[PDB]
């Protein structure tokens, strides 16, 4: 509703264009940047392939808008993981491929597993006097 008769471009504080009104149709659009980002690749010297993490992307978005691949995939907490088996039920006390938030990539194929470096010592003695 903000475009007056002499106005056709919406700018931010930095001087990027972020919206416009089309001179022919008078339709109004917001402009958003196309997605840009890195791939976090985990590699082990004893392996022939990478485990790939697309941080904060759901696998449907990666496959539809970035690239199709033949590799198996799943939606982990950190984002879409390719070429690793979802085994967060399993746990490891040491990890060379630390992904964040207590998740680790382990290699035998790759596994995506939880990192739990410390334990409590347990005894079966009574708590009560």
């Amino acid at each position: 509703v903000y475009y007056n008769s002499w106005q056709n471009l919406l700018y931010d504080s930095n001087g990027n264009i972020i919206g416009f009104k089309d001179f022919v149709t008078n339709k109004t659009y917001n402009i958003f940047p196309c997605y840009a980002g890195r791939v976090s690749a985990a590699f082990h010297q004893n392996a022939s392939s990478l485990a790939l993490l697309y941080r904060n992307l759901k696998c449907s978005y990666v496959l539809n808008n970035i690239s199709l691949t033949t590799q198996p995939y799943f939606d982990s907490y950190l984002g879409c993981v390719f070429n690793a088996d979802n085994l967060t039920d399993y746990s490891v006390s040491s990890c060379a491929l630390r992904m964040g938030s207590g998740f680790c990539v382990d290699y035998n194929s790759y596994r995506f597993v939880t990192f739990e470096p410390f334990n409590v010592s347990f005894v079966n003695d009574s708590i009560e006097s």
Binding site: A36, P117, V123
Partner: protein, 438 residues
């Protein structure tokens, strides 16, 4: 006056709680130097490749810095878990208070059957007041492809190659470690409480200040209620403009400010015709576009070197803070080291720890005098065959025209005995003469 001095000795007391946040971690900033300097523009990536290793140096320093943060977070978690032994019969759904002291708010879910719910009510109340914790950053970046009309600066930073990664251990794991380290003082084998019940440890710590045991073991209910009232006052204190919560928010704010300044460096012209590579490459051909783009490359690479040098300087302070927090876990929470103002100010009884965004929050509990009696005290007596005696953690006082001892932190006259005395084979000068004693 004669051999005696006027001293104010406490006649009543309470327990007071004091919060202390110590930073042990910081947001793991990672920069893609190539994406930051050149965006999607091939003509810039060509020129940036003729600068050679500068992006490799920026990436290598930031990977070292982030490895120092990861190693520090592991060393803090190791320090919390060191020596902790718990009973497998322990169930925090039923076991939450002992000896009239209530720990229900300090203890989360224990064991994997409850999942990531291991955050305590105290830690929940502390995390809910800080938007950009580790899970806060993960949710903000998850929303960048959500199609939302809201233009989050975190998304604009990430699309320009500036991003915060999650720490190697989630805050829910650390909250599990602070929960386990807390319950390790509550029940046998008491592995964090010198191998004795928590209330007896509190009682012996207060007695060590110069308070007679005879008042302590009759006032045990009043001491327990003072203790859990202090804990409730700490919890309620986060709703006010709390200095610990202000410090935690200042960690997030200083990070967000530094990233915002680094993003604003993309819009400086550095004496080129424009700050936009789109405008340069749509105005000039390669021979002149090169001259303009090279000014932008030098400006942006200088801004990255400045940001890297600031980041190295800051992470030195984060390592110093984490080393202090590990020292307080060891010497205030797991044990009571004989160091006066180390574990907070005043007559420090005991300390407890809870998880906090990018750090640990310590609660220090102190013996606080409420009211005082002015009394005449002797620092020593000369008795019998000029044998000297000095009081242990206390004073000699005249009571009913008879010499008696009192503890220095609580007025309670009790008879003089080898239990509360240091002997000397000769009494010093200006010790009060008392031939009738012993």
């Amino acid at each position: 006056v004669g051999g005696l001095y006027e001293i104010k000795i406490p006649t009543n007391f309470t327990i007071v709680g004091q919060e202390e946040f110590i930073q042990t971690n910081s947001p793991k900033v990672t920069i893609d130097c190539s994406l930051f300097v050149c965006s999607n523009y091939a003509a810039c990536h060509d020129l940036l490749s003729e600068y050679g290793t500068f992006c490799d140096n920026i990436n290598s320093i930031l990977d070292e810095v982030n490895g120092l943060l990861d190693t520090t977070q592991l060393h803090v978690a190791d320090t919390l878990m060191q020596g902790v032994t718990l009973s497998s019969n322990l169930n925090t759904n039923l076991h939450f208070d002992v000896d009239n002291i209530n720990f229900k708010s300090l203890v989360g879910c224990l064991g994997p059957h409850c999942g990531s719910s291991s955050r305590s009510f105290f830690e929940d109340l502390l995390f809910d007041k800080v938007k950009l914790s580790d899970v806060g950053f993960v949710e903000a970046y998850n929303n960048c492809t959500g199609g939302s009309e809201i233009r989050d600066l975190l998304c604009v930073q990430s699309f320009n190659g500036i991003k915060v990664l999650p720490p190697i251990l989630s805050e829910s794991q650390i909250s599990g470690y602070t929960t386990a380290a807390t319950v390790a003082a509550m029940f046998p084998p008491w592995s964090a409480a010198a191998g004795i019940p928590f209330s007896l440890n509190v009682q012996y710590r207060i007695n060590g200040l110069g308070v007679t045991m005879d008042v302590l073991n009759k006032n045990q209910k009043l001491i327990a209620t003072a203790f859990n009232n202090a804990l409730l006052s700490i919890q309620n204190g986060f709703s006010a403009p709390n200095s610990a919560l202000a410090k935690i928010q200042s960690v997030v704010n200083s990070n967000a400010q530094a990233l915002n300044s680094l993003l604003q460096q993309l819009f400086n012209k550095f004496g080129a015709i424009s700050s936009s590579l789109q405008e340069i490459l749509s105005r000039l051909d390669p021979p002149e576009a090169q001259v303009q783009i090279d000014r932008l490359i030098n400006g942006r690479l200088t801004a990255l070197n400045a940001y890297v040098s600031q980041q190295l300087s800051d992470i030195s302070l984060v390592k110093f803070g984490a080393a202090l927090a590990m020292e307080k876990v060891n010497e205030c929470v797991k044990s009571q080291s004989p160091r006066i103002n180390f574990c907070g100010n005043g007559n420090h009884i005991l300390s407890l720890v809870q998880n906090a965004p990018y750090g640990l929050l310590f609660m220090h509990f102190s013996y606080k005098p409420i009211s005082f009696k002015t009394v005449l005290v002797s620092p020593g007596l000369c008795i019998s065959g000029d044998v000297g005696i000095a009081p242990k953690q206390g004073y000699f006082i005249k009571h009913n025209d008879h010499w008696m001892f009192t503890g220095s932190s609580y007025y309670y006259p009790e008879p003089i005995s080898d239990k509360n005395v240091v002997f000397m084979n000769t009494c010093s000068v200006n010790f009060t003469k008392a031939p009738l004693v012993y």
